[PDB]
Amino acid sequence: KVTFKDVAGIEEVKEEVKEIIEYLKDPVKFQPPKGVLLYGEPGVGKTLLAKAIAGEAHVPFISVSGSDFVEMFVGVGAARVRDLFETAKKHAPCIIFIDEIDAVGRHDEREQTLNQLLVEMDGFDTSDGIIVIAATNRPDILDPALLRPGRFDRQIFIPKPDVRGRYEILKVHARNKKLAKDVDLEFVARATPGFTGADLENLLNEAALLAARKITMEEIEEALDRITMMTISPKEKEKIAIHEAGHALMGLVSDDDDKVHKISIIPRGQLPIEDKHIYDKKDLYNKILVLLGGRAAEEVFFGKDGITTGAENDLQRATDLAYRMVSMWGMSDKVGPIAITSPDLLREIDEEVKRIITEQYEKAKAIVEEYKEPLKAVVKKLLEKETITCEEFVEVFKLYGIELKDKCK
Amino acid sequence: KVTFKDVAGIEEVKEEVKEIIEYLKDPVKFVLLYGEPGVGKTLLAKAIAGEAHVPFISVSGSDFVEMFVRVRDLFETAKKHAPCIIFIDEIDAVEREQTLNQLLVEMDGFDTSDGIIVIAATNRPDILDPALLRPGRFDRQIFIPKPDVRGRYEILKVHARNKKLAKDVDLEFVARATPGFTGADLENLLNEAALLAARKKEEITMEEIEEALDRITMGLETISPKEKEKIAIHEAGHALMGLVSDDDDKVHKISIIPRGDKHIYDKKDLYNKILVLLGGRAAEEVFFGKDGITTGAENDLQRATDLAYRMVSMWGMSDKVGPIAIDTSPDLLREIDEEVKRIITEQYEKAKAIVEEYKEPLKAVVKKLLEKETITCEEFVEVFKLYGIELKDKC
Amino acid sequence: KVTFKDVAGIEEVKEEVKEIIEYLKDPVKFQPPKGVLLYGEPGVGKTLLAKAIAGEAHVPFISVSGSDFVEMFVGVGAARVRDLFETAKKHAPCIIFIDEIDAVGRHDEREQTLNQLLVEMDGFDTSDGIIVIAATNRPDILDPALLRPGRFDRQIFIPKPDVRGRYEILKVHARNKKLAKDVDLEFVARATPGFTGADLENLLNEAALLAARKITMEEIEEALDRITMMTISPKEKEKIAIHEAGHALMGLVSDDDDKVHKISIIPRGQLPIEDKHIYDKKDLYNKILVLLGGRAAEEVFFGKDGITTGAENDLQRATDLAYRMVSMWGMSDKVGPIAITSPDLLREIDEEVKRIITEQYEKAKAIVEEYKEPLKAVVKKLLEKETITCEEFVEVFKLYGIELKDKCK
Ligand SMILES: Nc1ncnc2c1ncn2[C@@H]1O[C@H](COP(=O)(O)OP(=O)(O)O)[C@@H](O)[C@H]1O
Ligand SMILES: Nc1ncnc2c1ncn2[C@@H]1O[C@H](COP(=O)(O)OP(=O)(O)O)[C@@H](O)[C@H]1O
Ligand SMILES: Nc1ncnc2c1ncn2[C@@H]1O[C@H](COP(=O)(O)OP(=O)(O)O)[C@@H](O)[C@H]1O
Ligand SMILES: [Zn+2]
Ligand SMILES: [Zn+2]
Ligand SMILES: [Zn+2]
């Protein structure tokens, strides 16, 4: 059995999949939902989420793994996919769950089967009554063709749980076991930042050794320390808080930008496809400034000897974008309106890129230097809660006589 | 019954299929449609069938295999009730290899002078087999573009006539409020608001029309209007340079809607093609300034520069470099880059000066295109004549 | 039925294939002809030429396309080729026509079948009584092994028809239809430069719409304008005339060179194989000068702002050859007798190449500047006729008191 109680710490994902649940329950009543792509680190509850979606609508669950499809002989995988959809159509309504989708997605051996999969996605119309759920641990290798309309057009991220999420997951797993009264799961949630649901289940199961010898806090602590011997250290919590806080500050103070999301020491999220948009010079300057917020805050607070690697992913994108401004979009007066080479031109390009990056970085550093005290306050609140809202950020900054731009999603 | 009266917003496609209609009408004395879903492909096929007053044999490619596992019998029945049209929806879907072989062997084998024709509908043309487009095999293809303001207004009228909406409502505002919609989208919108009125009336009102429009829009939840303005200005710069060309080929109708021959050329023609490719960005900078230029010109900026290279390294059109065409020493690459920059900056200054000269008629054209989402080269020429500027009447 | 009347505009190709026709008619009487390779743009009449060769000798015609050979399973194509030659030997005498040969030619999937083809070419001796004809639209990708002796050793180009060729093709196609008296096909031929036979047939068939509504000149013109909406424009005719005229002038005035061919605004022809020859420094200088004639004439007549892209193909070869003179044949005193690197050597090579090219280009420009009036006369004649003979060129230039070298093939 898999019910709503078995999932915890992701109300947004539940709200997003309620529509698919209604689709599985009553296909007629709706007057699309075709493919749902779940992505996240291993052990975050993707297969659990699929099983829960299946059990909520009270429909069958057809589970399969791509790993056994690919590694076969010519014709095995394509016939396997075809026969799968045959079973699904015969046993309609149901969910077809394909674990490790990106590993298989990545003419040739693997390609023919994936083509069969896409032909199946396109063949079943919305009156067949079926849906397909796919889970992946490595999304960067996925083929963009899988994200086209009518073919896994909807994507969902399963972030790691914060204090509340970890507490709820602990409560969920505890039900089967008869723990002691003295235990305080809240302290456990506050003492295991950066853990996944499977990781915490491993803690509850780990205390099985203590029950074997004798569940009390002694076992929970011994098992958390054993697995640790990867909880996020408090210094790492502070660093991540300052990074996300710089991001939020730059997003809020930008002259013109898009809505800002909820702050959290948990990762923000990737897996790009067609942006299908256009941007101007100032908008790109501002996006760069945003991507440079975390590192600027790090340097301002800890100094030049404190900057961290957490901005890696960030630091890349920013610089990457800068290149697209000079070598692809001709947004440089020095270089000129030329898009694509002799060493002189590459030198000019690099000089302009460094100019842009250093300008925006000095700008971000000055911004942070101006509003250091409310930033410290926000960091304290985020540390105590591990997750705050854009509105709470605005409130903390208003407490210092600083009126920020009112743009929250 | 389905005739052209049921179809609206595609006069060009009607002109193109008039020939097939006449062929179906008179066999003795005497096709692949592609576009996004819900644009009216099956409707267009049914309309051609009803216009020629001939049977309509509908089938879906997805259903071929298990139904034909035959094509022979399908075409035999089509020939029996000839003249007629054999419509195959979901053509791309067409075990499948053998069936597709049979289908193409029939297309080439059947000397379909019995009076029958074959129409196929597809949503993704990139996945269609090119072999299907051989002579006698879907020799001509047709695209169904999305309706503009006027097109959406007409389609709204088409479906609205049957149900009699409220008196106060005026569809023109609706057409102006639904950019990027298809015909099926408008059908679902009208039917949804009538159903909502039933749930509430039997006379469907603007409030309900909005109740459904806001619902569909929320489903979309969006291109900002500023993006519309930017696309308008870009396409307008393109149209201005192409229409104002010293020497050029014909220019097509301008449009902000998503898009998704000469044998040999001379130096000036290539300069002019570059100038055309640089029009959008020049207009962007002139209007919004150096801090407003956008990424929409990306592809364009590529082609332009690309062409410049072909002018220096392949066609020897540089006096400094000389008549040498193509490992190369750094000095030669430096000379090439310097000449390319010279050409590009020269043509860009030229384009900027041109735009600076004619900014007011450009603003007027942008306004008209924004309100209409699509104007004709002739309308462009008229707007520019309204300011005492007489352009060459070449469309 | 396919007869001699169905082919028009290529008397040279007919003269070349008369031998193969005699071979098909009487195999005994001859006291080799093995493979004939036809190459040209699509719609020029390659398959029509093969069918005509088959019908003239009154022998069977075994038509097949390589496209259906390649895309099969292992063994399909090789057995297909083998069984083809089995049918040909059983049904001897006949022609084995393989359309789209280069597409298939281009161990591995495709290679095994091509090997079978070559083994068949080598296996049937001249007493089997069979021949093989191959047609291709893209010859640049063809494997040189296919052009070896006894294996498609003879090659033929099907050029586009000029005024006379287009007129004759129009007459040929007209027979089936009952056109009006007012029509003048000569004007059509003069008004459709750069068209192929299939293109013109499309014009005659296009007038079918006018016959449906009501064939008169109105329909022919409406259909030519429709298809155009690619006839060569008159300015393009002038440019091509001047290009070919510069070529002919440089070929005729060269101190030592090979015979010059007939001038025509139609393309000259490619598909290289073993040259099996040797050349000297002066001969290569002269070949370069020839390849630079068209562009020199273009600049002299229209100025530096008139040079065109028609010389593209030409401009490449010339420069390419120049490189072979310095980096492969040691024909540079500055560089020295070294054949194959530090940047200095590459710089020296490039400087010598530019020296050679600019020298020969100034030479060609001076030559043209000397004889501009007879060149204009020749261009006028070529424009009016679209094709002149080397002898007519010599006559036009003699009319101005200029005696050219008497070397015409
Ligand atoms: N958010 C969560 N809430 C409750 N349990 C979870 C959660 N995430 C993971 N688990 C537990 O972890 C285990 C592995 O779940 P699974 O979905 O297979 O991991 P993944 O989807 O990351 O590969 C399950 O037994 C489940 O009980
Ligand atoms: N251009 C149009 N004008 C009027 N109605 C249209 C148009 N396009 C689509 N429709 C409506 O949308 C519905 C779907 O049409 P259809 O052609 O079957 O969709 P598709 O061709 O995308 O499969 C029809 O009921 C039709 O009335
Ligand atoms: N030189 C020509 N003379 C007469 N008809 C021609 C000529 N070239 C092409 N055609 C016409 O064009 C059509 C296509 O001929 P085909 O040989 O198949 O083209 P290709 O060989 O270029 O692929 C034929 O129906 C033929 O009547
Ligand atoms: Zn970050
Ligand atoms: Zn553009
Ligand atoms: Zn040439």
Side-chain angles (χ1 to χ4, degrees), chain A residues 2 4 6 8-9 12-13 16-17 21 23 27-28 30 32-33 35 38-47 50 52 54-55 57-61 64-67 70-71 75-79 81 84-85 87-88 91-95 97 99-100 103 105 113 116-117 121 123-124 128-129 132 134-136 139 143-145 148-150 152-153 155 157-159 161-163 165-166 168 173-174 176 180 183-189 191-198 200-201 207-208 211-212 217 223 227-228 232-234 236 238 240-254 258 261 263-265 267-269 272 275 277-279 281 283-286 289-312 314 318-323 325-354 356-358 360-362 364-368 371-374 377-379 381 383 386-397 399-401 408, chain B residues 3-4 6-9 12-13 15 17 21-23 26-27 30-31 33-35 37-43 45 47 49-56 58-66 68-69 71 73 75-78 82-85 87 89 92-93 99-100 104-110 112-113 115 120-122 125 129-131 133 135-136 138-139 144-145 147-149 151-153 156 158-160 163 166 168-170 173 175 177-184 187-189 193-194 197-198 203 206 212 217 219-225 232 234-239 241-242 245-246 249 251 255 258 260 262-283 285-289 291-297 299-301 304-306 308-318 321-326 328-331 333-340 342-351 353-358 360-361 363-366 368 370-381 383-388 395, chain C residues 2 4 6 8-9 12-13 16-17 21 23 27-28 30 32-33 35 38-47 50 52 54-55 57-61 64-67 70-71 75-79 81 84-85 87-88 91-95 97 99-100 103 105 113 116-117 121 123-124 128-129 132 134-136 139 143-145 148-150 152-153 155 157-159 161-163 165-166 168 173-174 176 180 183-189 191-198 200-201 207-208 211-212 217 223 227-228 232-234 236 238 240-254 258 261 263-265 267-269 272 275 277-279 281 283-286 289-312 314 318-323 325-354 356-358 360-362 364-368 371-374 377-379 381 383 386-397 399-401 408:
Chain A
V2 187
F4 292 94
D6 300 323
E12 185 174 358
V13 181
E16 197 172 320
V17 302
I21 295 172
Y23 174 83
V28 169
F30 262 52
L38 316 174
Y39 57 101
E41 290 193 12
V44 298
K46 292 175 259 57
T47 73
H58 186 60
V59 296
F61 183 78
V64 70
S65 184
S67 58
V70 283
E71 297 188 7
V76 175
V81 177
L84 163 55
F85 289 85
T87 66
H91 301 300
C94 66
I95 293 175
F97 182 76
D99 188 8
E100 306 173 2
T113 41
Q116 183 54 64
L117 172 61
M121 295 301 292
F124 84 90
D128 296 62
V132 187
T136 176
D143 189 16
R148 303 188 71 168
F152 299 100
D153 58 4
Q155 309 78 26
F157 177 58
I158 295 78
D162 68 303
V163 179
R166 295 191 299 271
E168 298 296 349
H173 274 103
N176 67 277
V183 310
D184 179 14
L185 299 177
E186 174 60 17
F187 170 78
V188 181
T192 59
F195 262 50
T196 62
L200 300 173
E201 189 282 346
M217 275 303 281
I227 190 66
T228 297
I232 302 181
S233 62
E236 288 174 21
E238 186 182 16
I240 300 165
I242 291 172
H243 180 83
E244 302 297 337
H247 284 324
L249 178 61
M250 302 301 171
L252 282 167
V253 181
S254 60
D258 70 330
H261 303 75
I263 301 93
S264 179
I265 70 99
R268 292 194 297 280
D275 189 15
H277 280 76
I278 48 86
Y279 307 99
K281 186 172 182 182
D283 293 355
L284 299 168
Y285 271 83
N286 296 337
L289 189 67
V290 171
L291 288 164
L292 300 176
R295 172 57 67 87
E298 291 174 10
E299 175 167 338
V300 170
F301 279 65
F302 305 92
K304 290 192 172 184
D305 296 5
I307 55 179
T308 66
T309 70
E312 175 182 76
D314 291 69
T319 307
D320 171 292
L321 200 67
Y323 273 102
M325 295 179 63
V326 186
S327 61
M328 293 186 69
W329 304 329
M331 297 177 178
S332 179
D333 295 333
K334 179 182 177 181
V335 175
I338 48 174
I340 52 176
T341 62
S342 64
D344 298 80
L345 190 63
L346 296 169
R347 179 183 52 71
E348 291 185 14
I349 292 170
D350 296 10
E351 291 174 348
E352 290 298 74
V353 171
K354 182 176 288 188
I356 296 170
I357 296 293
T358 57
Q360 300 307 113
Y361 186 67
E362 293 182 354
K365 274 164 52 176
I367 292 171
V368 178
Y371 317 100
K372 191 168 181 176
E373 316 300 340
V378 171
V379 170
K381 281 277 279 191
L383 281 168
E386 283 186 21
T387 183
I388 59 177
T389 66
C390 179
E391 295 77 4
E392 288 177 337
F393 192 111
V394 175
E395 280 290 1
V396 174
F397 259 75
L399 183 138
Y400 286 74
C408 299
Chain B
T3 50
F4 284 148
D6 300 323
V7 185
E12 294 79 355
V13 181
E15 264 296 283
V17 302
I21 296 172
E22 296 178 5
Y23 169 84
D26 189 354
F30 181 92
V31 184
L33 316 174
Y34 58 101
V39 298
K41 291 175 259 57
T42 75
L43 176 67
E51 286 293 354
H53 312 289
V54 296
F56 185 78
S58 180
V59 70
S60 183
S62 58
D63 301 6
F64 283 9
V65 180
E66 82 298 355
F68 300 143
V69 177
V71 177
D73 296 7
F75 283 101
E76 288 169 1
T77 62
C84 67
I85 187 168
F87 182 77
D89 188 8
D92 53 318
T99 306
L100 172 54
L104 57 91
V105 167
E106 295 293 8
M107 295 302 293
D108 253 9
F110 256 87
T112 319
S113 61
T122 177
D129 188 15
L133 287 179
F138 297 61
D139 80 72
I144 299 303
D148 69 303
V149 180
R152 294 192 297 270
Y153 189 46
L156 281 168
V158 172
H159 266 101
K163 285 185 293 299
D168 48 334
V169 318
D170 129 57
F173 169 79
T178 59
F181 265 51
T182 62
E187 183 179 16
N188 305 120
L189 161 54
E203 30 70 66
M206 270 304 280
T217 295
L220 194 278
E221 185 227 9
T222 36
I223 304 182
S224 158
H234 181 84
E235 303 297 337
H238 283 326
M241 300 300 176
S245 61
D246 101 29
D249 72 330
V251 185
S255 179
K262 197 196 213 183
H263 285 297
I264 53 88
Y265 310 75
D266 64 24
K267 185 172 182 182
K268 267 237 294 180
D269 292 355
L270 300 168
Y271 271 82
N272 297 337
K273 285 196 177 296
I274 290 172
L275 189 67
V276 171
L277 289 164
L278 300 176
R281 172 57 67 86
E285 175 166 338
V286 170
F287 279 64
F288 305 92
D291 55 359
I293 55 179
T294 65
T295 70
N299 183 17
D300 291 70
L301 265 179
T305 307
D306 171 292
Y309 273 103
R310 293 176 177 268
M311 294 178 62
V312 187
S313 61
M314 292 186 69
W315 302 328
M317 298 177 178
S318 179
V321 175
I324 48 174
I326 51 176
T328 62
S329 64
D331 298 80
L333 296 169
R334 178 184 51 70
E335 290 186 14
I336 293 170
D337 296 10
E338 291 174 348
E339 291 299 73
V340 171
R342 182 193 61 80
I343 296 170
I344 296 293
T345 57
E346 179 180 1
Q347 300 307 113
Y348 186 68
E349 294 283 4
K350 188 167 182 172
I354 293 171
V355 178
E356 284 280 6
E357 185 171 6
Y358 317 100
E360 316 300 340
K363 294 168 174 178
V365 171
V366 170
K368 188 172 186 178
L370 281 168
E371 62 157 330
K372 291 182 68 178
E373 284 184 21
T374 301
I375 59 177
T376 66
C377 176
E378 295 77 4
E379 288 177 337
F380 191 110
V381 175
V383 173
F384 259 74
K385 286 174 174 173
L386 260 69
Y387 286 74
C395 297
Chain C
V2 187
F4 292 94
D6 300 323
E12 185 174 358
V13 181
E16 197 172 320
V17 302
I21 295 172
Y23 174 83
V28 169
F30 262 52
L38 316 174
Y39 57 101
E41 290 193 12
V44 298
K46 292 175 259 57
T47 73
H58 186 60
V59 296
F61 183 78
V64 70
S65 184
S67 58
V70 283
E71 297 188 7
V76 175
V81 177
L84 163 55
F85 289 85
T87 66
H91 301 300
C94 66
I95 293 175
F97 182 76
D99 188 8
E100 306 173 2
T113 41
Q116 183 54 64
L117 172 61
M121 295 301 292
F124 84 90
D128 296 62
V132 187
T136 176
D143 189 16
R148 303 188 71 168
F152 299 100
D153 58 4
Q155 309 78 26
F157 177 58
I158 295 78
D162 68 303
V163 179
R166 295 191 299 271
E168 298 296 349
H173 274 103
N176 67 277
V183 310
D184 179 14
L185 299 177
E186 174 60 17
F187 170 78
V188 181
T192 59
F195 262 50
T196 62
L200 300 173
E201 189 282 346
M217 275 303 281
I227 190 67
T228 297
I232 302 181
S233 62
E236 288 174 21
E238 186 182 16
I240 300 165
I242 291 172
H243 180 83
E244 302 297 337
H247 284 324
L249 178 61
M250 302 301 171
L252 282 167
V253 181
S254 60
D258 70 330
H261 303 75
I263 301 93
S264 179
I265 70 99
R268 292 194 297 280
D275 189 15
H277 280 76
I278 48 86
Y279 307 99
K281 186 172 182 182
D283 293 355
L284 299 168
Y285 271 83
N286 296 337
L289 189 67
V290 171
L291 288 164
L292 300 176
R295 172 57 67 87
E298 291 174 10
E299 175 167 338
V300 170
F301 279 65
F302 305 92
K304 290 192 172 184
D305 296 5
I307 55 179
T308 66
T309 70
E312 175 182 76
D314 291 69
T319 307
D320 171 292
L321 200 67
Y323 273 102
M325 295 179 63
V326 186
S327 61
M328 293 186 69
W329 304 329
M331 297 177 178
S332 179
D333 295 333
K334 179 182 177 181
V335 175
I338 48 174
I340 52 176
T341 62
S342 64
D344 298 80
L345 190 63
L346 296 169
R347 179 183 52 71
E348 291 185 14
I349 292 170
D350 296 10
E351 291 174 348
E352 290 298 74
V353 171
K354 182 176 288 188
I356 296 170
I357 296 293
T358 57
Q360 300 307 113
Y361 186 67
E362 293 182 354
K365 274 164 52 176
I367 292 171
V368 178
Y371 317 100
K372 191 168 181 176
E373 316 300 340
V378 171
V379 170
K381 281 277 279 191
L383 281 168
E386 283 186 21
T387 183
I388 59 177
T389 66
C390 179
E391 295 77 4
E392 288 177 337
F393 192 111
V394 175
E395 280 290 1
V396 174
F397 259 75
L399 183 139
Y400 286 74
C408 299

